Amino acid sequence: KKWTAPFEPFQLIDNIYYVGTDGIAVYVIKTSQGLILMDTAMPQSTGMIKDNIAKLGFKVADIKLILNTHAHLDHTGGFAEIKKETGAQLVAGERDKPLLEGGYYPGDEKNEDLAFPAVKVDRAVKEGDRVTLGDTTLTAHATPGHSPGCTSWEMTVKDGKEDREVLFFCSGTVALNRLVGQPTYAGIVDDYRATFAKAKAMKIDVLLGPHPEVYGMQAKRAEMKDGAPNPFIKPGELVTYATSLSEDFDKQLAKQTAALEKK
Ligand SMILES: NS(=O)(=O)c1ccc([N+](=O)[O-])cc1
Ligand SMILES: [Zn+2]
Ligand SMILES: [Zn+2]
Ligand SMILES: [Zn+2]
Ligand SMILES: [Zn+2]
Ligand SMILES: [Zn+2]
Ligand SMILES: [Zn+2]
């Protein structure tokens, strides 16, 4: 369904371009010294992603860096292919390196339906690390929980004369993760808690993420018009979204906890 369904690519704000599917967000960041690719999609969708890149007039061969938000197959599925064909370097949060290099789902390592083609991490990042290509720098923020190395990426764009701060938020959903009993990884609950709080304290103009549902992409795209305000600028949104995530987290934690009582 949605994850592999097409969506027309577009310039989102300044040098950030959407090239994902209807259900998985992928971005090209255009720099003075080549392209940065933010994530990929499912392993079967790599051709579609490359075609979307070409539809905007970009060359896949110009990709120099590939950045990851988090190491699940729906975001990493094209990494091994694109890295091999371009010679790009892969940059990811240090604690997701084992996931990326093994091509497995943490705490469910034998589940082949969650596997992806293994890929080596060239640069393992930590909180505050700066990744520069030409005129463009992204800053890594450690926002674990959804994965142990989940990295939210900060960058500055222009809106007319003014700076606006973008966060590629890495994801904060519970989704398939086990929080209790046999947790997906050690300290997962504390990580989620810390991440919700951290997200609410950041000063972010433009919320993005690895699924369009993170930021209501489709509705904003519909509102775009030459000379009208860029609808992706909503500075309160990360607070609102993190609050919704935290509230769902509480529900999932309670559900999973109750489920430990064997009947
Ligand atoms: N990123 S996620 O947590 O929304 C997610 C990734 C993969 C699957 N999957 O393959 O079933 C489910 C959920
Ligand atoms: Zn088209
Ligand atoms: Zn995920
Ligand atoms: Zn996902
Ligand atoms: Zn290819
Ligand atoms: Zn930070
Ligand atoms: Zn579950």
Q: Looking at residue 98, which CATH number applies to its domain?
A: 3.60.15.10
* Region class of 217: left (phi > 0), else alpha (psi between -120 and 50), else beta: alpha
Contact of 153 with 138, CB cutoff 8 Å = yes
Ligand-binding annotation for 70, yes or no, is yes
Neighbours of ion ligand 3 (CB under 5 A): 72
d(CA 112, CA 110): 6
75 annotated among ligand-binding-site residues: yes
Q: If DSSP codes are grouped into helix, strand and coil, which group holds residue 122?
A: coil
**Sign (positive/negative) of CA torsion 118, 119, 125, 131?**
negative
Q: What is the atom index within ligand 1 of the atom nearest the CA of 146?
A: 3
Q: Which one-letter DSSP state was computed for residue 8?
A: -
Q: Which amino acid is at 74?
A: D
Number of Cβ within a 10 Å radius of residue 4:
15
Angle at 7 between CA 155 and CA 202, to 5 degrees: 25
Give yes or no for a contact between 166 and 204, defined as CB atoms under 8 angstroms apart.
yes
Strands 34-38 and 27-31, sheet pairing: antiparallel
Q: Whose CA is nearest to atom 13 of ligand 1?
A: 175
Distance 218 CA to ligand 4 centre (A): 17
Count of CA atoms in the C-beta half-sphere (13 A) of 68: 40
Task: Collapse the DSSP code of 160 into the 3-class scheme (helix H, G, I; strand E, B; otherwise coil) and give the result.
Answer: coil
CA distance 5 to 22: 5
Instruction: Give Cα separations from 98 to 13, 45, 70, 103, 262 (angstroms).
Output: 33, 23, 12, 8, 33
Protein residue with least CA distance to atom 3, ligand 1: 175
- Per the document, the length of the chain is 263
User: What is d(CA 113, CA 44) in angstroms, rounded to the nearest whole number?
Assistant: 12
Nearest CA to ligand 1 atom 5: 175
Q: What are phi and psi of 259, to 5 degrees?
A: -65, -20
**Ligand of minimum distance to the alpha carbon of 84:** 5
Which domain, by its residues, includes 244? 1-263
Q: What is the resolution of this structure in A?
A: 1.2
Q: How many domains does the chain have?
A: 1
Experimental method: X-ray
